[PDB]
Amino acid sequence: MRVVVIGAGVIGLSTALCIHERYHSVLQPLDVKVYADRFTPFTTTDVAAGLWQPYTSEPSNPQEANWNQQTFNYLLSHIGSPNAANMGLTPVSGYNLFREAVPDPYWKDMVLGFRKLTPRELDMFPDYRYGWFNTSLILEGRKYLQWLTERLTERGVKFFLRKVESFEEVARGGADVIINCTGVWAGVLQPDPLLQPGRGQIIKVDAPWLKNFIITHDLERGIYNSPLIIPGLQAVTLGGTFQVGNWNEINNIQDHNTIWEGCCRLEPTLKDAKIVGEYTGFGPVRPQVRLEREQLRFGSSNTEVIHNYGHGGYGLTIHWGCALEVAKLFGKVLEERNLLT
Amino acid sequence: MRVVVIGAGVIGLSTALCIHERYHSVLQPLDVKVYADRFTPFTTTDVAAGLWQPYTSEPSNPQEANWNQQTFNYLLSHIGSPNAANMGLTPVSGYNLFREAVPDPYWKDMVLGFRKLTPRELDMFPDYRYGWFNTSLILEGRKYLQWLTERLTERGVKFFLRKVESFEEVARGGADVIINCTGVWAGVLQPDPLLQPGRGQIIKVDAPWLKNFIITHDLERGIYNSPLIIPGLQAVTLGGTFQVGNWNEINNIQDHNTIWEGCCRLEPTLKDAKIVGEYTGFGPVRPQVRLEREQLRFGSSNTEVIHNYGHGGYGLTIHWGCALEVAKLFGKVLEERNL
Numbered sequence: 204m205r206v207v208v209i210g211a212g213v214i215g216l217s218t219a220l221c222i223h224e225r226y227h228s229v230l231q232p233l234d235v236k237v238y239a240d241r242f243t244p245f246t247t248t249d250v251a252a253g254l255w256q257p258y259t260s261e262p263s264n265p266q267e268a269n270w271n272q273q274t275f276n277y278l279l280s281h282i283g284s285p286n287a288a289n290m291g292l293t294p295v296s297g298y299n300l301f302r303e304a305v306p307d308p309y310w311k312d313m314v315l316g317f318r319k320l321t322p323r324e325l326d327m328f329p330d331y332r333y334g335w336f337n338t339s340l341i342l343e344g345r346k347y348l349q350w351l352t353e354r355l356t357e358r359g360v361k362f363f364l365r366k367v368e369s370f371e372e373v374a375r376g377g378a379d380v381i382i383n384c385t386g387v388w389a390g391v392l393q394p395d396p397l398l399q400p401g402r403g404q405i406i407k408v409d410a411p412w413l414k415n416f417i418i419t420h421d422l423e424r425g426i427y428n429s430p431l432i433i434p435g436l437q438a439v440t441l442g443g444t445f446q447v448g449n450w451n452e453i454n455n456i457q458d459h460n461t462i463w464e465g466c467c468r469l470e471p472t473l474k475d476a477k478i479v480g481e482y483t484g485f486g487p488v489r490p491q492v493r494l495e496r497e498q499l500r501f502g503s504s505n506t507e508v509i510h511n512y513g514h515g516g517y518g519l520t521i522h523w524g525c526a527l528e529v530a531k532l533f534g535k536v537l538e539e540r541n542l543l544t
Numbered sequence: 545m546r547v548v549v550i551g552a553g554v555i556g557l558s559t560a561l562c563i564h565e566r567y568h569s570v571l572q573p574l575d576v577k578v579y580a581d582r583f584t585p586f587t588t589t590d591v592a593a594g595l596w597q598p599y600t601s602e603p604s605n606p607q608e609a610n611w612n613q614q615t616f617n618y619l620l621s622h623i624g625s626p627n628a629a630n631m632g633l634t635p636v637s638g639y640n641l642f643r644e645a646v647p648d649p650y651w652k653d654m655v656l657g658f659r660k661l662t663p664r665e666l667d668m669f670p671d672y673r674y675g676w677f678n679t680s681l682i683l684e685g686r687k688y689l690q691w692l693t694e695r696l697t698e699r700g701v702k703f704f705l706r707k708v709e710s711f712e713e714v715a716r717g718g719a720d721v722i723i724n725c726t727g728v729w730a731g732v733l734q735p736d737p738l739l740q741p742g743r744g745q746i747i748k749v750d751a752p753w754l755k756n757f758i759i760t761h762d763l764e765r766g767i768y769n770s771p772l773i774i775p776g777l778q779a780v781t782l783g784g785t786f787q788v789g790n791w792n793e794i795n796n797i798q799d800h801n802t803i804w805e806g807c808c809r810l811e812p813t814l815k816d817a818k819i820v821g822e823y824t825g826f827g828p829v830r831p832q833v834r835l836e837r838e839q840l841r842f843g844s845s846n847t848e849v850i851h852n853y854g855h856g857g858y859g860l861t862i863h864w865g866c867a868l869e870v871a872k873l874f875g876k877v878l879e880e881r882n883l
């Protein structure tokens with residue numbers, strides 16, 4: 204097979220690795236390439252806060268819950284490994300804060316040590332009356348992309364700077380199988396009105412004393428439209444906006460203020476933190492992830508496309524389960540052609 | 545009333561602040577001075593790992609448990625304050641690891657969210673079979689001393705870099721009350737054969753990805769003679785030796801190795817951590833803290849000494865309850881003098 208993966212964000216690179224690992228040994232002429240028009244540090248993935256945590260409500264497609272779980276167990280299994288930090292991975296503990304009682308999240312047993320906050324814990328965060336504590340994992344987008352591209356490179360997977368104009372051009376360039384991991388821009392290659400940009404702005408800050416994630420929720424204003432603080436490997440991400448439908452890629456002043464003042468209110472020690480950068484990214488928001496096979500005809504030959512996009516504000520959290528599912532669908536492509544695992 | 549506090553480590557400065565904050569308003573004149581022969585960054589306190597956690601067995605003296613508790617409640621209540629990190633203070637969560645089941649510690653309800661580790665959690669730590677999780681606080685010795693000295697200075701408490709040769713000399717120089725916070729060197733001013741150095745060596749490392757404390761225990765080799773990892777504000781402290789009776793203030797090779805290999809085995813990501821410094825300090829080990837009043841008699845008057853030393857490897861953990869108790873004893877002194 205000639206396989207072209209389109210996209211070098213978390214979804215693209217994880218999928219490319221997962222396919223290569225699973226099928227290199229049984230399919231000798233396996234030729235896997237990555238095409239993309241943005242690589243680290245210039246992908247949405249690089250701008251991600253870095254935390255493993257699904258949305259608070261159950262997803263429309265319950266398969267997503269398994270993909271999240273598989274991703275956690277996968278990442279957890281590297282803790283104890285000498286290279287966990289080089290992969291962008293380290294354990295972190297933290298708080299989820301609410302202005303009123305809410306049900307437990309579906310993921311409460313996936314994380315480690317989930318429990319309700321006690322009154323003394325609530326005293327640390329005055330504006331809030333209810334919440335959770337748990338241990339989870341940091342997965343830093345930037346570092347993980349760098350790890351994946353090294354792992355891919357060693358396995359002979361080749362990377363190409365290419366702005367793909369259509370699936371047609373890639374098929375006629377020889378690809379038997381196209382894996383579509385184009386994130387929020389997938390609509391360019393095939394219209395998909397269910398896919399919308401989730402505009403998130405963040406402030407990165409030097410405040411190494413903060414060891415815990417702190418995520419506040421506002422049930423009325425929707426997910427991640429409430430202050431959040433996430434310690435990274437070297438810096439801390441401050442957030443608080445996540446606006447669907449907004450394609451403006453420039454930082455604005457009003458969101459900066461919302462983030463800074465919301466987070467300084469949550470964590471007043473931030474007064475002494477040095478601003479290191481400010482960024483805006485677009486979460487690929489969709490009612491559910493698109494992860495499915497599609498057959499396209501160009502001339503007399505069929506081309507196989509597998510889509511993997513629309514992971515909203517949880518791409519890091521879910522990526523590995525999705526990569527595994529794409530590999531499963533790839534297996535079926537092979538078996539449809541009398542090829543064997 | 546001239547009060548000379550001897551010592552500028554955590555014990556000395558906390559005590560001086562507590563006395564001054566308690567009596568400045570009601571006693572004129574009150575003159576509080578600090579004498580010491582080392583200030584930050586040169587005290588044992590500056591070398592401390594930074595974590596709030598008492599020893600695993602309860603203390604002989606039941607007052608010590610309360611002092612620990614008062615210290616936790618004091619420090620916790622600064623979380624929310626804009627200056628907590630400038631004080632050297634931040635919350636941390638972490639793991640206490642054992643090769644076998646042990647009883648719960650007496651302090652289990654003082655910390656936040658104490659529980660046993662689950663089977664899943666234990667897999668993260670291949671070498672260990674049982675443990676605890678809880679949330680506590682980092683109190684960085686260095687930063688806390690800088691904070692206390694600023695708070696003291698602003699309130700007009702004066703410092704003097706001075707080696708005290710005897711209590712007598714300080715009394716004769718005009719002190720009505722001496723607070724003895726000389727840590728492991730208290731024996732120089734008054735022999736105390738119960739007081740021994742607890743020699744601890746540590747390695748400081750840049751490994752900012754480590755967000756949790758990890759403390760292992762070896763029931764066979766004694767407290768803190770087993771690998772420990774404690775994230776500080778800017779650096780991580782790696783430890784694993786604590787020998788009573790050893791007065792060598794120089795780093796040695798064996799302890800470096802014990803610490804590095806123990807901790808690299810616990811936390812193999814340490815392979816990429818840059819060494820920042822290696823240090824040795826002396827914990828003031830005593831069967832129990834000495835915190836008591838004593839009357840001395842030189843010249844034409846009595847001078848009151850209040851001792852506050854012998855806090856072993858838990859001086860940061862216990863300091864504030866001790867400072868409070870000394871301020872109380874000071875109150876008694878004042879009333880006996882009809883102030």
Ligand SMILES: Cc1cc2nc3c(=O)[nH]c(=O)nc-3n(C[C@H](O)[C@H](O)[C@H](O)COP(=O)(O)OP(=O)(O)OC[C@H]3O[C@@H](n4cnc5c(N)ncnc54)[C@H](O)[C@@H]3O)c2cc1C
Nearest residue numbers: 210211212214241247248252253254367386403518519520
């Ligand atoms: C501020 C913010 C914080 C977030 N924090 C988190 C978090 O803490 N945890 C979490 O799980 N998720 C988080 N997310 C969610 C989100 O899913 C991730 O950011 C994720 O990066 C999306 O992955 P992706 O690979 O599909 O897209 P991207 O990372 O955007 O990568 C897409 C790739 O496709 C390429 N591409 C697209 N179109 C073409 C074309 N026509 N030709 C060639 N190449 C093309 C791009 O160049 C790029 O290489 C966050 C999102 C935002 C905005």
Ligand SMILES: Cc1cc2nc3c(=O)[nH]c(=O)nc-3n(C[C@H](O)[C@H](O)[C@H](O)COP(=O)(O)OP(=O)(O)OC[C@H]3O[C@@H](n4cnc5c(N)ncnc54)[C@H](O)[C@@H]3O)c2cc1C
Nearest residue numbers: 552553581582588589593594595708727744825859860861
């Ligand atoms: C490696 C290590 C790690 C530790 N980690 C922790 C931890 O994580 N948590 C915790 O709670 N505890 C910890 N401890 C214990 C803690 O460091 C000590 O209990 C504490 O610092 C002792 O405080 P101190 O003020 O009594 O002594 P010091 O900080 O040693 O202060 C002694 C002071 O007295 C002065 N002085 C002495 N004699 C004279 C004299 N004759 N004239 C003038 N000045 C004099 C000195 O100059 C100095 O100012 C640790 C100890 C060590 C060695």
Ligand SMILES: C[C@H](N)c1ccccc1
Nearest residue numbers: 252254403427442445516
């Ligand atoms: C951390 C959380 N996944 C997030 C999502 C969108 C924008 C900011 C933060």
Ligand SMILES: C[C@H](N)c1ccccc1
Nearest residue numbers: 593595744768783786857
């Ligand atoms: C963390 C603990 N208090 C400790 C004591 C002595 C040496 C290292 C660590």
